[PDB]
A = this chain, B = another copy of it.
Amino acid sequence: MFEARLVQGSILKKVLEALKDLINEACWDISSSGVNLQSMDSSHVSLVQLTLRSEGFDTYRCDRNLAMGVNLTSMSKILKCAGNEDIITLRAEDNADTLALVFEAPNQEKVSDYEMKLMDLDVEQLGIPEQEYSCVVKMPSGEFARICRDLSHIGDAVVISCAKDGVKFSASGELGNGNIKLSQTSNVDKEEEAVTIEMNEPVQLTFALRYLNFFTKATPLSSTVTLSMSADVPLVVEYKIADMGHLKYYLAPKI
């Protein structure tokens, strides 16, 4: 038996809401150390890596490594039947072709029990080259979402320029161009309002806005986001999942 009881159900709701548009199907690599997902998106452009560590779960049980192939659109639909404050328990027999999802209200008067059909899929594998990056921008998650959205009216691509004297997002198109300059803070007082740049050398990279606008569906999961960049390698957009792990999205620059 695999069995994982997650007390804050909102978290799994949000993860599915952040993945279902970008990718339709993917295998859930389950083990004693946690749950891990790794997939390309459905247009073969970006890469996604999800991690939810075992200890994040209130109760956790994994007799042996499972791989469950999963339609995320169906999984999301089922999770929309969960409340935000439900305790969600995930359960699969060792080689069973189903995943049960139990949504307990907090007072135990209402209990829901769903049994999802798996789909049978060939796993993907990479993980990408772990790297020391030139720039690391930490910033509010709501601010990053709004920027990508604003600039998507102007252009299909965004140039992210970092230097010592700031970060800048620029886009360009048929109706013109725009530049959004977001200043580092010093003493912001809260921690989650900070804009901090860890800079080694200036960098200027171009990314497809369409894909960044997918990545920002993870905003509910965290109040900050970090962008790690270096020349000619994929951007990582990282959202922390409430002490349990993370959702990274990798994207090639143009060129």
Q: Is the CB of B107 within 8 A of A181?
A: no
| Residue A111 CB within 8 A of the other chain | yes
Q: How far is the CA of A111 from the CA of B147 in the complex (A)?
A: 11
Residues in B with CB closer than 8 Å to A59 are none
Which chain B residue shows the least CB distance to A117? Answer: B176
From residue 22 to 78 of chain A, which have CB atoms closer than 8 A to chain B?
Answer: 71, 73-74, 77-78
Q: Is the CB of B110 within 8 A of A143?
A: yes
Q: Is the CB of A109 within 8 A of B178?
A: no
Q: Residue-by-residue, is A96-114 near B (CB-CB < 8 Å gives 1, otherwise 0)?
A: 0110000000011111111
Residues in B with CB closer than 8 Å to A177 are 114-115
Q: Is the CB of B78 within 8 A of A153?
A: yes
| Residue A180 CB within 8 A of the other chain | yes
Q: Is the CB of A109 within 8 A of B195?
A: yes
Q: Is the CB of A193 within 8 A of B107?
A: yes
A154 → B minimal CB distance (Å): 7
Q: Is the CB of B114 within 8 A of A77?
A: no
Q: Is the CB of A110 within 8 A of B181?
A: yes
Q: Is the CB of A111 within 8 A of B176?
A: no
A34 → B minimal CB distance (Å): 24
Interface of A is mostly: mixed
- Pick the contact of A175 from B78, B143, B153, B174 — CB < 8 Å? B78
Residue among A98, A108, A110 with the highest chain B CB neighbour number at 10 A = A110
Residues in B with CB closer than 8 Å to A175 are 71, 73-74, 77-78, 116-117
| Residue A123 CB within 8 A of the other chain | no
Q: How far is the CA of A74 from the CA of B153 in the complex (A)?
A: 8
From residue 114 to 151 of chain A, which have CB atoms closer than 8 A to chain B?
Answer: 114-117, 143, 150-151
| Residue A185 CB within 8 A of the other chain | yes
Q: How far is the CA of A108 from the CA of B190 in the complex (A)?
A: 11
27 contacts between A and B (CB under 8 A): A74-B153, A74-B175, A74-B176, A77-B153, A77-B175, A78-B153, A78-B175, A78-B176, A78-B178, A80-B153, A81-B154, A81-B178, A98-B176, A107-B190, A108-B183, A109-B185, A109-B193, A109-B195, A110-B143, A111-B180, A111-B181, A111-B183, A112-B178, A112-B180, A113-B181, A115-B177, A117-B175
Top-6 shortest CB links A-B: A74-B175, A109-B193, A116-B176, A81-B150, A107-B191, A114-B178
